[PDB]
Amino acid sequence: PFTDIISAFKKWDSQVGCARFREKYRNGSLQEKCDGLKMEHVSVLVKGWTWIPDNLDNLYSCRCGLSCLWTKSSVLVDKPDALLFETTTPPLQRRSGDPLRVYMDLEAGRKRSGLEDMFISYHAKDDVQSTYAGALFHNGRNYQVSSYKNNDTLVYWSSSRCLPQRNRLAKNLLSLLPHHSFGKCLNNVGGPDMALSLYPECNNDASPRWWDHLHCAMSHYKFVLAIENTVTESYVTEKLFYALDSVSVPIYFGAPNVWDFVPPHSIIDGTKFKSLEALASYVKDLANDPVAYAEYHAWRRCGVLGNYGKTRAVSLDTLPCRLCEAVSRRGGRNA
Amino acid sequence: PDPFTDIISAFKKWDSQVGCARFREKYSLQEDKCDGLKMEHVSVLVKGWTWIPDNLDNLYSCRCGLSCLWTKSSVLVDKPDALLFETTTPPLQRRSGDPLRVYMDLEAGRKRSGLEDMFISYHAKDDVQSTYAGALFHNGRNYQVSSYKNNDTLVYWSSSRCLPQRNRLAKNLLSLLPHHSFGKCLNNVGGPDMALSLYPECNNDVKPRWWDHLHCAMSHYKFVLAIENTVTESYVTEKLFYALDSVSVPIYFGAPNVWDFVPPHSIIDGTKFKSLEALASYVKDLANDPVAYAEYHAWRRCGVLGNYGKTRAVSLDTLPCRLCEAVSRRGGRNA
Ligand SMILES: *[C@@H]1O[C@H](CO)[C@@H](O)[C@H](O)[C@H]1NC(C)=O
């Protein structure tokens, strides 16, 4: 029933070793030359948004000598090459010589507005993909990662939009695993903001906010329960990725193609078990096996990312440049 | 002779009278082959620092299929390939199999510790360059850019570490130009914290920090005075770049090779005038000529960055990837 994560890493190094890991894991769902770029500089004005962060605003330097000015200020860009509308209605029509219309929605469904020339979603088969494996949204958080895992409680969970089926699965699974549930749904920790009470070191000096201490709180738990609000192709949100960011193993119920997005041996796919009891038994055995637990961090410690590298390459953090690149290939205002 | 205040009107007048085509007709940094990469994944642990921000921490996806895990947490990286020390003393010795020792200092002088295997500075001839033209350092700021320039007051300046030569230059120049001086040195606004008194819209809605409103305040002024604390080769700091970020023309006293870093016709180099009175006369004449003033923004509006693109390409924002690539070419721990 270990609590020292670094000791577990060392024991795994002694018994298994990264060389064995690399051989055992030496054996499409993501968007992957400087010949089509018609514009050496592209400007993007974020005209409408609901959540798009200010911390995306920048004059980025992209590949192929492309410059990309992304801003919400019409003074910085008064004649943009493209307008981005995130969950906002684009113009009804586009005449040639008007800026390109870009619509963006990362919620499940790939709901195009029908008034865009380009669509941004989480899916690779749309115009520009933006995955959730990024650091720019919710930037300015607490970055502490605990060196001690909880001895009794193994599972973290937080949900505040209590959906019937998700809550049903959560109740059934959490009845078999000692857990802390900090959200409004199925709370077993008491009040509404107990995460900062148990772990005062996770407080953000700048703030509060629900996300400023999420990673730090998760880092204390060996497992994080991650259940998406919608089961559909390529819809993998921060519920998984933040756990990977916080040295915690996610127990995942979500997109069927999740293994195209995550590193090898990094998550516990709940859909791959015959029963919830078998899942809980596996989790309880992992909580008492430091070597087998550290196998789930060997992807990070040994640098075997598998498909995770490609996933983070097309996240929100790189969205401006790639969007600018596409705008450059289309001629911008001359499309 | 128009003492203009509408910056966009000046932009449109310049567009009609001058145009981007005529502008394009009229007109050291580290640049970069994917085979020397001996490591497909590199980890960097920031072991010592004084100012390096937490929000640089991320698992970056870089060029040539390289992954780069940059963090301050020994839990995220317990066996780093490289240790970074920013203005802190590295280990006295390095044995093979130890992480590479990286020392970093962006202050003028390129002063090393003598105990590093890699040196990061602002200069291109050191191991890895990090210019000041980045957006990540003070990410949490106000992004409003004023559409109105001041009619009477033409120059913004702020300095609070009063250096003799800089203060003499500032006193002589600012006696000839209507100006607002907000720092402790040569204050003419009535005391400290006066910027938020004049421009309440520049408030950052997070705890109030000193840097939250510099760009927004500068956007109200046609010109920003930027005098470096040291005149030396390639030492161009944010005193210039923030003015470029807030649509204000900087009057620059600094590095002799500054024109290798900035866009064409983007700054006023004060050393290129016979006297400070001639400089003040040129600035006063420019403040009443909206077309000639907007020529100084044509670099941004027409997407002609010149050398500015490369400068931003090697700023702090891209430092993790570039450092990781350099470590990968050297073999990391096996050097
Ligand atoms: C301010 O602008 C007004 C209107 O253009 C003008 O009459 C006045 O002379 C200006 N004052 C200064 C100090 O520039």
d(CA B95, CA B97): 6
* Residue A182 CA: distances (Å) to CA of A17, A104, A144, A192: 36, 31, 19, 7
Task: Calculate ∠ Cα A35-A40-A43, nearest 5°.
Answer: 125
Q: CA dist A41 to B240, B305, B317, Å?
A: 22, 8, 19
- Residues on chain A touching B144 (C-beta within 8 angstroms): 73
Beta-carbon separation of A140 and B145 below 8 A: no
Q: Which helix (H) or strand (E) holds A155?
A: strand A155-157
User: CA distances (Å), A5 to each of A11, A290, B197, in order?
Assistant: 10, 8, 51
Helix (H) or strand (E) run with residue B149 in it: none
The two three-digit tokens of residue A18, written as one number = 């990264």
A294-331 b/e (C-beta count within 10 Å ≥ 16 → b): bbbbbbbbbbbbbbbbbbbbbbbbbbbbbbbbbbbebe
Which residue out of B41, B202, B297, B327 would a mutagenesis test of the A interface target, given it has the greatest number of A Cβ atoms within 10 Å?
A: B41
Helices and strands counted in chain B (H then E): 11, 12
Cβ contact A229:A166 at 8 Å: yes
* CB of A240 closer than 8 Å to CB of A267: yes
Q: Are B161 and B222 contacting, i.e. CB atoms less than 8 angstroms apart?
A: no
Contacts of B299 in chain A (CB under 8 A): none
Closest CA to B244 of B183, B297, B313, B179: B297
Cα–Cα distance for residue pair A271/A253, rounded to 1 Å: 6
Q: Cα distance from A134 to chain B (closest Cα, Å)?
A: 8
Could you give the maximum distance between any two Cα atoms of chain B, in Å?
Answer: 69
**Structure-token pair, residue A32:** 């992957």
For residue B65, the chain A residues in CB contact (below 8 A) are: 309
Solved using: X-ray
Residue B74 and residue A145: Cα distance in Å, rounded? Answer: 8
Q: Which atom of ligand 1 is nearest to the CA of B178?
A: 13
Which chain A residues contact residue B69 at CB under 8 A? 300
The closest of A78, A87, A115, A106 to A241, measured between CA atoms, is: A106
> Min CA distance, A142 vs chain B (Å)?
8
Pairing of strands B155-157, A249-253: unpaired
Closest C-alpha to A133, from A11, A44, A234 = A234
- Angstrom distances, CA of residue A10 to CA of A16, A241, B75: 10, 24, 12
Phi/psi at A310 (5° precision)? -65, -40
Taking CA A58 as the corner, what is the angle to CA A55 and CA A64, rounded to the nearest 5 degrees?
A: 130
Q: In angstroms, rounded to a whole number, what is the distance separating the alpha carbons of residues B113 and A256? A: 52
B67 vs A65, A71, A303: nearest CB: A303
Q: Which helix (H) or strand (E) holds B90?
A: none
Smallest Cα distance from B36 to chain A, Å: 18
User: Cβ contacts (< 8 Å) between B307 and chain A: which residues?
Assistant: none
| Nearest CB neighbour to B312, from listed A5, A61, A145 | A61
The C-alpha of B318 sits at a distance from chain A's nearest C-alpha, in angstroms, of 9
Partners of residue B48 on adjacent β-strands = B85
| Closest C-alpha to B242, from B261, B260, B263, B219 | B219
Beta bridge mates, A249: A223
Q: How is the beta sheet containing B155-157 ordered, strand by strand?
A: B179-181, B155-157, B223-227, B249-253, B268-269
CA of B283 to the centre of ligand 1 (A): 17
Q: Whose CA is nearest to atom 2 of ligand 1?
A: B151
Residue at token pair 């003040």 = B280
Closest CB to B247 among A42, A75, A309: A75
| Total length of chain B | 335
C-alpha span between B225 and A60 (Å, rounded): 25
Q: How far is it, in rounded angstroms, from Cα A118 to Cα A127?
A: 6
B284: helix, coil or strand?
helix
Report d(CA A152, CA A182) in Å as an integer: 16
Query: Is residue A166 a contact partner of residue A252, using CB atoms and an 8 Å limit?
Result: no
- Angstrom CA distances, B84 to B91, B96, B102, B120, B189, stand at 11, 17, 5, 9, 42
Cβ <8 Å between A143 and B54: yes
Q: Give the C-alpha separation, B327 to A65, whole Å.
A: 24
Residue B3 CA, ligand 1 centroid: distance in Å: 6
Q: Which of B13, B46, B73 to mutate to test the interface with A (most CBs of A within 10 A)?
A: B73
Question: Which atom of ligand 1 lies nearest, measured to the CA of B152?
Answer: 13
SS3 for A263? coil
**Closest alpha carbon to A280 in A183, A161, A169:** A169
Cβ contact, residue pair A206, B140, below 8 Å: yes
CB-ligand 1 contact for B148 (6 Å cutoff): no
Domains of chain A as residue ranges with CATH = 5-27+136-296 (3.40.50.11660), 41-130+314-329 (3.40.50)
- Alpha-carbon distance of A206 to B145, in angstroms, equals 23
* Alpha helices, H only, B149-199: 164-174, 195-198
Q: What is the DSSP letter of A318?
A: G
Q: For ligand 1, what atom is nearest to the CA of residue B4?
A: 5
- Put simply, the answer to whether B143 touches A71 (Cβ < 8 Å) is yes
3-state class (DSSP) for residue A315 = strand
Q: Which of A49, A52, A107, A102 is nearest to A234 (CA)?
A: A107
Q: Which residue of A has its CA nearest to B71?
A: A143
Centre of ligand 1 to C-alpha B285, Å, is: 15
How deeply is A14 buried, as exposed, middle or buried, from its count of CB atoms within 10 A (0-12, 13-18, 19+)? exposed
Tell me B81's DSSP state: S
Q: Enumerate the residues of chain A whose CB falls inside 8 A of the CB of residue B58.
A: 135, 317
From ligand 1's centre to the CA of A216, what distance in Å? 55
- Using CB atoms, which residue from A63, A139, A247 is nearest to B55? A139
Please name the residue whose Cα sits nearest to atom 9 of ligand 1: B3
Token output for A15: 């018994």
Between CA B282 and CA B276 the distance in angstroms is 10
Inter-chain contact B206–A205, Cβ cutoff 8 Å?
A: no
CA distance B5 to B152: 10
Beta-bridged to residue B251, according to DSSP, are B225, B268
Distance between alpha carbon A330 and the CA centroid of its chain, in Å? Answer: 29
Q: Which residue has the tokens 């549930």?
A: A181
Residue with tokens 């609000």: A229
3-state secondary structure of B269: strand
B309 to A65: CB separation less than 8 angstroms, yes or no: yes
Cα B126 from Cα B28, distance rounded (Å): 11
DSSP assignment letter at B256:
T
Query: Residue A59: in which H helix or E strand, if any?
Result: strand A58-61
**Does residue B152 have its Cβ closer than 6 Å to ligand 1?**
yes
> What are the structure tokens assigned to A149, written together?
């895992």
Which atom of ligand 1 sits closest to the CA of residue B151?
14
Q: Whose CA is nearest to atom 12 of ligand 1?
A: B152
**How many Å apart are CA A246 and CA A258, to the nearest integer?**
19
Contact B68, B42 (CB under 8 A): yes
